[PDB]
Amino acid sequence: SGEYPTVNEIPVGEVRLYQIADGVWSHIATQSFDGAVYPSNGLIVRDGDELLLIDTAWGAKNTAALLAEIEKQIGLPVTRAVSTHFHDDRVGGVDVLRAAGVATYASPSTRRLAEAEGNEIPTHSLEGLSSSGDAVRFGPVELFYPGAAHSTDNLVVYVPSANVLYGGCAVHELSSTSAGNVADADLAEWPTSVERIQKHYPEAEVVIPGHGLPGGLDLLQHTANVVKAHKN
Ligand SMILES: C[C@H](OCc1ccc(CN)cc1)c1cccc2c(-c3ccc(CS(C)(=O)=O)c(Cl)c3)c(C(=O)O)[nH]c12
Ligand SMILES: [Zn+2]
Ligand SMILES: [Zn+2]
């Protein structure tokens, strides 16, 4: 009823949307992984009379439910999707999107890692993002590669019309006490990559983590703090 959704409002298989700003929503879903249940976020950005989707809802059935929820709540077609790294919470559901006519995109780094891992593979490669600090436009957003952090391929997304920074899994929520799933992370480089985000997007007003509650710019420093403490 208006607060940011959590698993206690989200059975696995259901999707909720949350209005972030004019023409910007997050999507929230829950999934089971290794015997525990987790929430995860993605983004939806209005692109004229179409929608740009950032990240799947972590699974085929969740992503089908996401498309149905978008039709119910927004009613504009999702035409393109970008996955911000190669893990299942970002690409799991790409096959569903592709069969629903959505054009799916990711960096070549993400595509190679997804393929090697056996995860679903976005169709189209996003060039121009291979060096840290790189940025490219994609419809109503800017895609930015900050360097290795949560994963070597992680991208962040900025919505300039609303000063919304979608950090994906390189950014953690304020209540977090650990750095999440670090199996593919670079804990030593992560703070430097976060510093690059801070320098590039100093006017961000909303910061959205890959998992958990949005907040403000403090999520960036908090993420560096939790990562440094995990490393140590
Ligand atoms: C889908 C993704 O795959 C990662 C992966 C990597 C490698 C392998 C081996 N090839 C297999 C899978 C995945 C799966 C499960 C958990 C996570 C978490 C996560 C973990 C703990 C917490 C704290 S919490 C809520 O427990 O208190 C939080 Cl927030 C987030 C993240 C994340 O940090 O982004 N990503 C996750
Ligand atoms: Zn991940
Ligand atoms: Zn994640």
User: 25 CB contacts (<8 Å, ≥6 apart)?
Assistant: 17, 18, 19, 43, 44, 73, 74
How was this model experimentally determined? X-ray
Residue 2 lies in a domain: no
The reply to whether ligand 1 has any atom less than 6 angstroms from the CB of 190 is: no
Burial (CB count within 10 angstroms: exposed 0-12, middle 13-18, buried 19+), residue 54? buried
Mutate to test the pocket of ligand 1, among 8, 181, 213, 227 (most ligand atoms within 8 A of CB): 181
Are 147 and 193 in contact, with CB atoms under 8 Å apart?
Answer: yes
Residue 110 lies in a domain: yes
3-state secondary structure the chain: CCCCCCHHHCCCCCEEEEEEECCEEEEEEEEEECCEEEEEEEEEEEECCEEEEECCCCCHHHHHHHHHHHHHHCCCCEEEEECCCCCHHHHCCHHHHHHCCCEEEECHHHHHHHHHHCCCCCCEECCCCCCCCCEEEECCEEEECCCCCCCCCCCEEEECCCCEEEEECCCCCCCCCCCCCCCCCCCCCHHHHHHHHHHHCCCCCEEEECCCCCECCHHHHHHHHHHHHHHC
Residue 178 lies in a domain: yes
Are 15 and 109 in contact, with CB atoms under 8 Å apart?
Answer: no
Mutate to test the pocket of ligand 1, among 85, 117, 211 (most ligand atoms within 8 A of CB): 211
∠ CA 130-131-134, rounded to 5°: 95
Residue 114 lies in a domain: yes
The reply to whether ligand 1 has any atom less than 6 angstroms from the CB of 184 is: yes
First to last CA, the chain: 40
Residue 173 lies in a domain: yes
Residue 25 lies in a domain: yes
What is the number of structural domains in the chain?
1
Question: Which residue's CA is minimally distant from atom 9 of ligand 1?
Answer: 183
Task: Provide the β-strand partners of residue 38.
Answer: 31
Q: Which two tokens stand for residue 206?
A: 């909303």
Residue 13 lies in a domain: yes
Whether 127 has a binding-site annotation, put simply, is yes
Residue 1 lies in a domain: no
Question: What are the C-alpha distances in Å from 5 to residues 55, 79, 94, 126?
Answer: 17, 25, 23, 31
Q: Which domain CATH number covers 33?
A: 3.60.15.10
Half-sphere exposure in the Cβ direction for 53 (13 Å, CA)? 33
Residue 147 lies in domain: 7-231
3-state secondary structure 120-141: CCCCEECCCCCCCCCEEEECCE
User: Cα(123)–Cα(116) distance, rounded to whole angstroms?
Assistant: 15
Question: What are the C-alpha distances in Å from 62 to residues 24, 29, 32, 67, 157?
Answer: 20, 7, 11, 9, 22
